[PDB]
Design an enzyme around this catalytic site. Structure first.
Site, PDB file in Angstrom:
ATOM      1  N   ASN A   1      -7.751   1.653   9.713  1.00 61.20           N
ATOM      2  CA  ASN A   1      -6.468   1.731  10.395  1.00 61.20           C
ATOM      3  C   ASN A   1      -6.777   1.683  11.877  1.00 61.20           C
ATOM      4  O   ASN A   1      -7.782   2.188  12.294  1.00 61.20           O
ATOM      5  CB  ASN A   1      -5.765   3.068  10.101  1.00 61.20           C
ATOM      6  CG  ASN A   1      -5.425   3.245   8.628  1.00 61.20           C
ATOM      7  OD1 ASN A   1      -5.572   2.318   7.831  1.00 61.20           O
ATOM      8  ND2 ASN A   1      -4.963   4.444   8.259  1.00 61.20           N
TER       9      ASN A   1
ATOM     10  N   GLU B   1      -7.807   8.445   5.846  1.00 60.93           N
ATOM     11  CA  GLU B   1      -8.163   9.125   7.080  1.00 60.93           C
ATOM     12  C   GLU B   1      -8.719  10.541   6.904  1.00 60.93           C
ATOM     13  O   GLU B   1      -8.152  11.510   7.425  1.00 60.93           O
ATOM     14  CB  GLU B   1      -6.951   9.137   8.025  1.00 60.93           C
ATOM     15  CG  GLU B   1      -6.564   7.753   8.491  1.00 60.93           C
ATOM     16  CD  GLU B   1      -5.412   7.777   9.515  1.00 60.93           C
ATOM     17  OE1 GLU B   1      -4.753   8.826   9.683  1.00 60.93           O
ATOM     18  OE2 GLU B   1      -5.176   6.735  10.128  1.00 60.93           O
TER      19      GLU B   1
ATOM     20  N   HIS C   1      -2.990  10.856   0.402  1.00 59.55           N
ATOM     21  CA  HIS C   1      -2.532  10.631   1.741  1.00 59.55           C
ATOM     22  C   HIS C   1      -1.883  11.949   2.229  1.00 59.55           C
ATOM     23  O   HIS C   1      -0.757  11.948   2.725  1.00 59.55           O
ATOM     24  CB  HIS C   1      -1.555   9.444   1.769  1.00 59.55           C
ATOM     25  CG  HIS C   1      -1.315   8.890   3.145  1.00 59.55           C
ATOM     26  ND1 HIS C   1      -1.555   7.575   3.469  1.00 59.55           N
ATOM     27  CD2 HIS C   1      -0.914   9.490   4.288  1.00 59.55           C
ATOM     28  CE1 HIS C   1      -1.245   7.370   4.735  1.00 59.55           C
ATOM     29  NE2 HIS C   1      -0.894   8.528   5.263  1.00 59.55           N
TER      30      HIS C   1
ATOM     31  N   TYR D   1      -4.629   1.796  15.939  1.00 54.47           N
ATOM     32  CA  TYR D   1      -3.371   1.867  16.642  1.00 54.47           C
ATOM     33  C   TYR D   1      -3.527   1.722  18.141  1.00 54.47           C
ATOM     34  O   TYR D   1      -2.650   1.153  18.824  1.00 54.47           O
ATOM     35  CB  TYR D   1      -2.632   3.187  16.348  1.00 54.47           C
ATOM     36  CG  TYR D   1      -2.054   3.234  14.946  1.00 54.47           C
ATOM     37  CD1 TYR D   1      -2.844   3.619  13.864  1.00 54.47           C
ATOM     38  CD2 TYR D   1      -0.743   2.871  14.712  1.00 54.47           C
ATOM     39  CE1 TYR D   1      -2.341   3.634  12.589  1.00 54.47           C
ATOM     40  CE2 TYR D   1      -0.199   2.890  13.446  1.00 54.47           C
ATOM     41  CZ  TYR D   1      -1.014   3.265  12.364  1.00 54.47           C
ATOM     42  OH  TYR D   1      -0.489   3.306  11.079  1.00 54.47           O
TER      43      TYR D   1
ATOM     44  N   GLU E   1      -3.731  -0.068   8.024  1.00 53.41           N
ATOM     45  CA  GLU E   1      -2.594   0.263   8.877  1.00 53.41           C
ATOM     46  C   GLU E   1      -2.749  -0.311  10.279  1.00 53.41           C
ATOM     47  O   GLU E   1      -3.793  -0.173  10.923  1.00 53.41           O
ATOM     48  CB  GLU E   1      -2.394   1.768   9.015  1.00 53.41           C
ATOM     49  CG  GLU E   1      -2.139   2.522   7.714  1.00 53.41           C
ATOM     50  CD  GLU E   1      -1.951   3.988   7.972  1.00 53.41           C
ATOM     51  OE1 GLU E   1      -1.648   4.336   9.143  1.00 53.41           O
ATOM     52  OE2 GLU E   1      -2.108   4.793   7.035  1.00 53.41           O
TER      53      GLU E   1
ATOM     54  N   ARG F   1       0.837  -1.183   0.000  1.00 53.08           N
ATOM     55  CA  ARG F   1       0.000   0.000   0.000  1.00 53.08           C
ATOM     56  C   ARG F   1       0.874   1.235   0.000  1.00 53.08           C
ATOM     57  O   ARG F   1       1.684   1.412   0.896  1.00 53.08           O
ATOM     58  CB  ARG F   1      -0.940   0.016   1.207  1.00 53.08           C
ATOM     59  CG  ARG F   1      -1.588   1.354   1.421  1.00 53.08           C
ATOM     60  CD  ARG F   1      -2.811   1.344   2.360  1.00 53.08           C
ATOM     61  NE  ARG F   1      -3.328   2.720   2.436  1.00 53.08           N
ATOM     62  CZ  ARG F   1      -3.369   3.469   3.538  1.00 53.08           C
ATOM     63  NH1 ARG F   1      -3.017   2.964   4.719  1.00 53.08           N
ATOM     64  NH2 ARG F   1      -3.836   4.710   3.471  1.00 53.08           N
TER      65      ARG F   1
HETATM   66  C1  LIG Z   1      -3.457   9.866  22.101  1.00 51.34           C
HETATM   67  C2  LIG Z   1      -4.480  10.179  21.029  1.00 51.34           C
HETATM   68  C3  LIG Z   1      -3.820  10.208  19.663  1.00 51.34           C
HETATM   69  C4  LIG Z   1      -3.860   8.833  19.004  1.00 51.34           C
HETATM   70  C5  LIG Z   1      -3.248   8.927  17.608  1.00 51.34           C
HETATM   71  C6  LIG Z   1      -3.593   7.662  16.833  1.00 51.34           C
HETATM   72  C7  LIG Z   1      -2.500   7.204  15.879  1.00 51.34           C
HETATM   73  C8  LIG Z   1      -2.404   7.964  14.571  1.00 51.34           C
HETATM   74  N1  LIG Z   1      -2.199   7.035  13.426  1.00 51.34           N
HETATM   75  C9  LIG Z   1      -1.094   6.753  12.714  1.00 51.34           C
HETATM   76  O1  LIG Z   1       0.083   6.451  13.303  1.00 51.34           O
HETATM   77  C10 LIG Z   1       1.179   6.325  12.359  1.00 51.34           C
HETATM   78  C11 LIG Z   1       0.443   6.397  10.997  1.00 51.34           C
HETATM   79  C12 LIG Z   1       1.019   7.406   9.979  1.00 51.34           C
HETATM   80  O2  LIG Z   1       1.159   8.709  10.559  1.00 51.34           O
HETATM   81  C13 LIG Z   1       0.093   7.370   8.749  1.00 51.34           C
HETATM   82  O3  LIG Z   1       0.577   8.193   7.709  1.00 51.34           O
HETATM   83  C14 LIG Z   1      -1.366   7.767   9.023  1.00 51.34           C
HETATM   84  O4  LIG Z   1      -2.162   7.315   7.900  1.00 51.34           O
HETATM   85  C15 LIG Z   1      -1.933   7.124  10.303  1.00 51.34           C
HETATM   86  O5  LIG Z   1      -2.689   8.098  10.996  1.00 51.34           O
HETATM   87  N2  LIG Z   1      -0.938   6.780  11.316  1.00 51.34           N
END
Ligand SMILES: CCCCCCCC/N=C1\OC[C@@H]2[C@H](O)[C@H](O)[C@@H](O)[C@H](O)N12
Length: 442
Positions: A292, A165, A120, A294, A348, A76
């Site tokens: 995605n 996103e 993106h 995290y 992701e 991707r």
């Molecule tokens: C403590 C609250 C904040 C939580 C943040 C959540 C994580 C953010 N997500 C990502 O973490 C890493 C990844 C990259 O920034 C990517 O380009 C983006 O598409 C995606 O957003 N990505």
């Protein structure tokens, strides 16, 4: 302990153009809003920019050889809008087209399936000057950009993502001002939300006209939100955060013709007057949803905010994001229950840890492995329960420019030494190769 995925399950890795490419102005490319944002003092940690990044613009072939060496089956990656159309619309930069054609052709030679993210976050600066995502006309700018991509690359790329996103693009970029274009205006932010949807839908509609035997979707960020207490307002606070922050902001529009109820209650005043005239177009049929994921978050009603995050005593990554694997299971179950998309991908999932290059010259990142393993296991449970998860993409192939965090946060399964641009495959890289080979965990 053995967890085998379905026949054909797609195992991938993801990147984004601004984060890895460098050479942002190469070969007549126009500036993007991330070029100008990161070149503004104060916007990015350490004054980092994507000027160089991983130098993927020159090292693309070797990076692809790394994917092939690891046996990973999908890649991707995103396309830089201004490399292709330096002025946003109109003149096409053939050398830009050429850079991605090589990547595309090389990927296919090696049996790696390209997933292309059309957008993106590196919007052309020239379009930002005309208002960017605030401008209703961007639905058509985006239509023309998409058409150019489909015409040029659609014969070979069959799997496409319109937007990475859109919540982040709209809200972190135009409300919180933490990402480009670095604005703080809630009325602009909800016009961005609405224009993102209109753009996405126009691209899908152009897609059906221009590409045969291809599938197109869209990718959402998602948090696993949990209530700080069983108080009614805390339970409500969680509903709001799910509707606003998660896929429903956009899938309710897409599958149902309107925004989620708690988002209307919160933000009707910020949306354009007759936004609902745009909903029947926005319901353009999509083929898959990309989620995605995290992190998990504990949430409470807070009158001084109307929702605040509450830090938990739980394990964290180098971002301070709480590691809550069951979250990816919850969100997978939830998306099916609420919207039942015919196909879903984890587009992701990954983690930043303070990686160390050892005297042996290896990068032993068992912590990243533990993170990925726990999440893959929870993903597997969701499949066993009827979620049509078709693939899993690790973020990321390479350590890279992590937006407002600069280079200090490393997400790679491949380490990048930025003094030399040398790649070192991390232990997590070898581990993930085995996952792919075994189609799961053993
Ligand atoms: C403590 C609250 C904040 C939580 C943040 C959540 C994580 C953010 N997500 C990502 O973490 C890493 C990844 C990259 O920034 C990517 O380009 C983006 O598409 C995606 O957003 N990505």
């Amino acid at each position: 302990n053995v967890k085998k995925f379905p026949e054909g399950f797609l195992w991938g890795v993801a990147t984004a153009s601004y984060q890895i490419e460098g050479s942002p102005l190469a070969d007549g490319a126009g500036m993007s809003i991330w070029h100008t944002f990161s070149h503004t003092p104060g916007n990015v940690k350490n004054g980092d920019t994507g000027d160089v990044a991983c130098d993927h613009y020159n090292r693309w072939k070797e990076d692809i050889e790394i994917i092939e060496k690891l046996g990973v089956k999908a890649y991707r990656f995103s396309i830089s809008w201004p490399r292709i159309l330096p002025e946003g619309t109109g003149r096409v930069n053939q050398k830009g087209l050429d850079f991605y054609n090589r990547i595309i052709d090389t990927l296919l030679e090696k049996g790696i399936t390209p997933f292309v993210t059309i957008y993106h976050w590196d919007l052309p600066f020239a379009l930002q000057l005309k208002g960017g995502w605030a401008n209703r006309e961007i639905a058509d700018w985006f239509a023309e950009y998409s058409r150019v991509l489909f015409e040029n690359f659609g014969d070979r790329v069959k799997n496409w993502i319109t937007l990475n996103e859109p919540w982040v693009v709209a809200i972190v970029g135009h409300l919180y001002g933490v990402h480009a274009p670095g604005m703080r205006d809630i009325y602009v932010a909800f016009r961005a939300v609405h224009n993102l949807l209109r753009a996405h839908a126009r691209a899908v509609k152009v897609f059906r006209e221009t590409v045969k035997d291809g599938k197109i979707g869209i990718v959402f960020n998602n948090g696993y939100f949990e209530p700080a207490s069983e108080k009614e307002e805390d339970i409500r606070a969680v509903r709001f955060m799910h509707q606003f922050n998660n896929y429903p902001l956009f899938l309710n529009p897409i599958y149902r013709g309107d925004y989620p109820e708690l988002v209307l209650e919160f933000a009707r005043e910020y949306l354009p007057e007759n936004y609902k005239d745009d909903m029947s177009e926005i319901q353009e049929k999509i083929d898959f949803v990309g989620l995605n994921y995290y992190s998990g978050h504990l949430v409470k009603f807070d009158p001084d905010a109307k929702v605040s995050f509450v830090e938990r005593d739980l394990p964290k990554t180098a971002m301070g994001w709480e590691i809550v694997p069951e979250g990816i299971y919850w969100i997978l179950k939830k998306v099916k229950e609420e919207y039942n998309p015919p196909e879903v991908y984890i587009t992701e999932n990954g983690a930043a840890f303070d990686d160390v290059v050892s005297e042996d010259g290896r990068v032993h990142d068992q912590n990243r492995i533990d993170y990925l393993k726990a999440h893959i296991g929870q993903a597997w449970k969701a499949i066993q329960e009827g979620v049509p998860l078709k693939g899993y993409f690790v973020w990321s192939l390479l350590d890279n420019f992590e937006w407002a965090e600069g280079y200090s946060k490393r997400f790679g399964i491949v380490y990048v030494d930025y003094s030399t641009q040398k790649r070192i495959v991390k232990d997590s890289g070898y581990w993930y190769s085995n996952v792919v080979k075994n189609n799961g965990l053993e």
